[PDB]
């Protein structure tokens, strides 16, 4: 996240850190979301490599023990049947992933709730964006976890001309792009929260951002429209 701020440790319980093995260390790669006890939403981008990946529930600081943790291991990828890794851009970035073991809730881990099924945002809603991705354009991860706030861009703003242009789809999230706050590399596949109707809400799954750089002006930071898949994650969910 360029031009965050530190999160409180218990402000987004819902959040995880997708990490994959190297050596005999462990790696930041994505972030996802906790939907069930043994669920996690994350994007398909960040499962195109055969890694062996784990999930960290209770995360704050991915350099120390923050005494919060649960270490869990991915059982289970199961990704759009639509999604194509040279077409990000097509949409249909979101991936499924069963844990090897059901994590115990509390106040630091916690289910993220989702939008009814079909619902879009009025153009500019109020959004946060979280995640230990890059903190700068060619930077390096945080440490600790990040949050930055990314009122929504509507459809019709997102794929004009000056903005996205045919990029964007209707399945997607546009967020930000005022040049100073964005996601950056390493936070794919977490969580946009949206506040409607009083509660917290993740409207969004961390897919892209320009080539360009992070945080570039008219070029907000896209996410896929998790109440476009509602089905297919009750479908997928229900014969898993
Ligand atoms: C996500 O972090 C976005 C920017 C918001 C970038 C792509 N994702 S990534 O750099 O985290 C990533 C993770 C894992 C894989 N993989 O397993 O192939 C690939 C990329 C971006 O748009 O550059
Ligand atoms: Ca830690």
Request: no cysteine; aromatic share 10%; net charge positive.
């Given at each position: 996240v360029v031009g965050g701020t530190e999160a409180q440790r218990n402000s987004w319980p819902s959040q995880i850190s997708l990490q994959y093995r190297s050596g005999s260390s462990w790696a930041h790669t994505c972030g996802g979301t906790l939907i069930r006890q043994n669920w996690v939403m994350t994007a398909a981008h960040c499962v195109d490599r055969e890694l062996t990946f784990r999930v960290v529930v209770g995360?704050?600081?991915?350099?120390?023990?923050?005494?919060t943790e649960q270490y869990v291991g991915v059982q289970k990828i199961v990704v759009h049947?639509?999604?194509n890794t040279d077409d990000v851009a097509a949409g249909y970035d979101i991936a499924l992933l069963r844990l090897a073991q059901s994590v115990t809730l509390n106040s630091y881990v916690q289910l993220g709730v989702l939008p009814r099924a079909g619902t879009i945002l009025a153009n500019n809603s109020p959004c946060y964006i979280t995640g230990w991705g890059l903190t700068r354009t060619n930077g390096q991860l945080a440490q600790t976890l990040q949050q930055a706030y990314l009122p929504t861009v509507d459809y019709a703003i997102c794929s004009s001309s000056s903005y996205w242009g045919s990029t964007v789809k209707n399945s997607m999230v546009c967020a930000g792009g005022?040049?100073?706050?964005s996601g950056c590399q390493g936070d794919s596949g977490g969580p946009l929260h949206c506040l409607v109707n009083g509660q917290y809400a993740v409207h969004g799954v961390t897919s892209f951002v320009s080539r360009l750089g992070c945080?570039?002006?008219?070029?907000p930071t896209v996410f896929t429209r998790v109440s476009a898949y509602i089905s297919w994650i009750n479908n997928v969910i229900a014969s898993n």
């Open positions: 995360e704050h600081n991915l350099n120390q023990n923050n005494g049947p639509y999604w005022d040049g100073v706050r945080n570039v002006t008219r070029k």
